[PDB]
Amino acid sequence: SLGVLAAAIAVGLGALGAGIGNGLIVSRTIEGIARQPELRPVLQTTMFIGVALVEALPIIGVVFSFIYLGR
């Protein structure tokens, strides 16, 4: 009964943290390519590298939330 909203706050705080981190990274990438267009491939490359790094630790919260719903 309590594990359901346990899993829910876990996936919700994960979504919040990944949304803020992804927003900071992607916003700074697009203002950086707005500063100069000549480096948009390397900035998109390090953009996806950054998005993976900030979306990595919330998704372990997601799968641990599924573990919490299991118990």
Partner: peptide, 13 residues
Amino acid sequence: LTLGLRLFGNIYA
């Protein structure tokens, strides 16, 4: 463990 859990979670979800 964060590299292993990174790939494991982001595929398993």
